[PDB]
Design a protein around this ligand. Sequence first.
Ligand SMILES: CC(C)CNC(=O)c1cc[nH]n1
Ligand SMILES: CC(C)CNC(=O)c1cc[nH]n1
Lengths: 412, 412
Amino acid sequence: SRRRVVITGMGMLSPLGLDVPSSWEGILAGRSGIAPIEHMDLSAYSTRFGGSVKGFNVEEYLSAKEARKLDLFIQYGLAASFQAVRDSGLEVTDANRERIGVSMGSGIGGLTNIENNCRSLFEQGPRRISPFFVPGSIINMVSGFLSIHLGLQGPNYALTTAQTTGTHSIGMAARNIAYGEADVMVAGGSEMAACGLGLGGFGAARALSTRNDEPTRASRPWDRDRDGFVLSDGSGALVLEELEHARARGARIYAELVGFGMSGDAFHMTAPPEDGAGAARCMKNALRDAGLDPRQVDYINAHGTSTPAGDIAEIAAVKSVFGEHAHALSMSSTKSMTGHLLGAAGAVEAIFSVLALRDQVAPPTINLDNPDEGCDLDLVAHEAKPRKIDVALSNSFGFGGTNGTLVFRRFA
Amino acid sequence: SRRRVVITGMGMLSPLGLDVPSSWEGILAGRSGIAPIEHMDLSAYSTRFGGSVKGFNVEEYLSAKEARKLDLFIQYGLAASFQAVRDSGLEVTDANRERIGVSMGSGIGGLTNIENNCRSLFEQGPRRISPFFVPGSIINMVSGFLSIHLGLQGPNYALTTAQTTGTHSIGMAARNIAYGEADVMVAGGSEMAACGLGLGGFGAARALSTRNDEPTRASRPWDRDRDGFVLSDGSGALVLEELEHARARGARIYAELVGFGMSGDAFHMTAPPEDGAGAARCMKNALRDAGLDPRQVDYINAHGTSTPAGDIAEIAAVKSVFGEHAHALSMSSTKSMTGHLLGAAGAVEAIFSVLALRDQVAPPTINLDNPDEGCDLDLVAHEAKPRKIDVALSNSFGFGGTNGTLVFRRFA
Ligand SMILES: CC(C)CNC(=O)c1cc[nH]n1
Ligand SMILES: CC(C)CNC(=O)c1cc[nH]n1
């Protein structure tokens, strides 16, 4: 029946690093990747900072000629994907290429490319729209280009569930493997929404921290003085592999993906219910999916976006699911350091949860200077905490009240 | 052993009609929904026609104020979804709401809303971007809004696989039910890409027919004079239901969804391999998934987009999968009449495949006046053909060489 699914490769671009080891070092050091934005003039914007991928060189991966036609989210997705596949040691052959697929998603996709092509259309005319505009901007083309570059003939798709995308992409890819639709999936998310429409759109919703004077202090999940999320760019990709397939080739296994939960809040497009009932249903689904006692959960990588409503509803959900055990587990928001990578948030955070299992350390929630009312769990304030982690849970919640939970455990 | 999945409700907005029965009356009458586009100045564009939804009244579904918050593609997906739920007679209760989910996707999503917000951003600056710009434009908001409106707490997601979206959405929803993760899913696709960036984008890629003098004859799949696809808008939704759940409430069952296939070409971004090998793999995968012999297929609803390369490669794939049986089955492109609904193409064509089973009639390929070299199958040229149909296949192929096949069978 269901096969087991393990993680054999990981790849990342984040505001903390151009790969997983560099990003993970920043996470354990409590380093902010948040800074005033340099690539554009934001003087008319109420938010002028975020998590950029600094010093990204697409020519470490792709020819300048190809990169020129690709939105940054595609470039970032491909880079993370290429890293994950190399990290896995997998050899794509005629014998296995039909069994290897990709599910790399995005919440927003090629908004920069769309904004630039809009400029061309309105300032000049449709004769100035790029012939590459559509395939260089649409969300499924991380999966599409990665399949073309590596010869992957397996299931090829893209999820778009806003800030849940990365979590759902990994969960559904794991289901593809579990049910025998594939033996290997490259799965994760990528995002680059840091153009005028992205910063302006989230700005127009009053969703973003306006702490321009101290950008590294802006993302402060569960802190009394939090005032909305920090917009960040990048990508995470994991190589997911059927367990017996991984054993057969002698793959290095990072961890086992044991649980995946999905749910809808069915409450509000942009706001969670105050009790976090949707997050609670999702986590319980994932825990049952994993065949676990909630007391087995040692570490939660929270969605923890630094929004007033979101942070407290997530505490509410965790308290509901874990009762007294909510006081024994460690929960942290790596968004304290990375900001909110939106569609990629769940992907980089799946990787941070797996590395919490490899290194037996809970990443910190930086900036948690004054926990808010009812935020009385172990939220790993300020500094990484070495502790026993056998089971780690990663939560993502998105616009539309779409929820995803991944459960990872150490593997023998 | 998996659970069986049946279709109990369908909804649609197409260039042929504001519901399923009006659209299907057009399909079987050989009617075109293609006309010069009226909603904009297309003087600088090489294509000035497409398949618009004519006379759509969002206030039959939403308050004017809910509707102002949402891109047209979201309005269209909600319309089709509300039709399908209503058509199914399903009653959402506290007992079942956790078992009812939604997978409504889009290929390109909120291009019109992005265009309109770009105009404000460049004319007046970011203070003029709508607060609802992001949640009202993102592809998962059909799934999100439908779940909030109907109280659906089951799996909530959206696929974006370009022109394969509707096929994949329906196939993965069917997997959700087959493997016990939901009892009911609303699945399909919506698209409204007939704006400047849509006609501009595909036009820059020379992907579109430029037959501005005869818009109704532009979409001519397998015809020697074909010159690119016709851009169309609309939406398809199906209520997928676990068979025992459908029978227990006395649901009317249109057909059974017995097979789903996915594959990647891993070849080119916008053109198939000339042998259609990825499409051949995808169809074999869906037939193996259904436990069917190729000889059991009576009707194929082709991808059939009216592109020089795609039409011919789809013939090669069908000839390769079905050998001698390629000449017994009937295959037609309803895009001859509807044009290419992109992300919604596979959703409306799944509905047309189900109604081909219900009514025992292969819809025509209109405008097939001079079939091209090797286009010598039964392509149902010009006129609907009544015939035995026990098994219908629906193919969708999209940018990145992402392929999906659905297999439907008569339910007695
Ligand atoms: C609905 C919003 C956009 C995201 N939701 C959360 O932040 C959350 C927290 C607890 N449950 N959902
Ligand atoms: C790969 C493009 C975007 C579409 N694909 C086809 O048209 C096709 C035909 C036979 N096999 N693939």
